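Students often ask why we bother predicting the structure of a whole assembly rather than each chain alone. The short answer is interfaces. A chain on its own may look different once its partners are present, and contacts between molecules only exist in the joint model. In this exercise we take two input lines together and write out one structure for the complete complex. Read the inputs first and try to guess which parts will touch.
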Amino acid sequence: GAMIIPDEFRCPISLELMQDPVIVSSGQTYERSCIQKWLDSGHKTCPKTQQPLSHTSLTPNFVLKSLISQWCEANGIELP
Amino acid sequence: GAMIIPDEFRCPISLELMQDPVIVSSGQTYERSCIQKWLDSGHKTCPKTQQPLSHTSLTPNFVLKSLISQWCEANGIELP
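Now the answer. The structure tokens for the assembled complex follow.
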């Protein structure tokens, strides 16, 4: 293969391969490091979709992680 | 390629293609129909993770949907 990696496996802000991908209540995907900064800043809104967060969720990771593994196995490349 | 559709794309319980995918606060993937039946039964918990639900969030679909589209485009077939 040796082709550009899919955008879904790279966070928009990161613009590179993510290490600890997670999902927010809004359903958007952000890097663990990034979300920590966001929480630290005291932000309670989602800038990507531009909507407020009136609730929290436990959703960490799931299908995306599984799909990444399948992709990695096909390419024979270890995960981040 | 694409000999067989990904397990992730298929519902874990039904094991079939879904038209209205949703994710619980536990980040578990369930079919809209399945969730309605579960709710009708009076159950408000996550059996896969074995934990109760005390809140809700807006997480119907996101990256997962995007990955499906790429998969379908590769096969040149319309979405389920």
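Check your guess against this: The longest helix of chain B spans residues 63-75.
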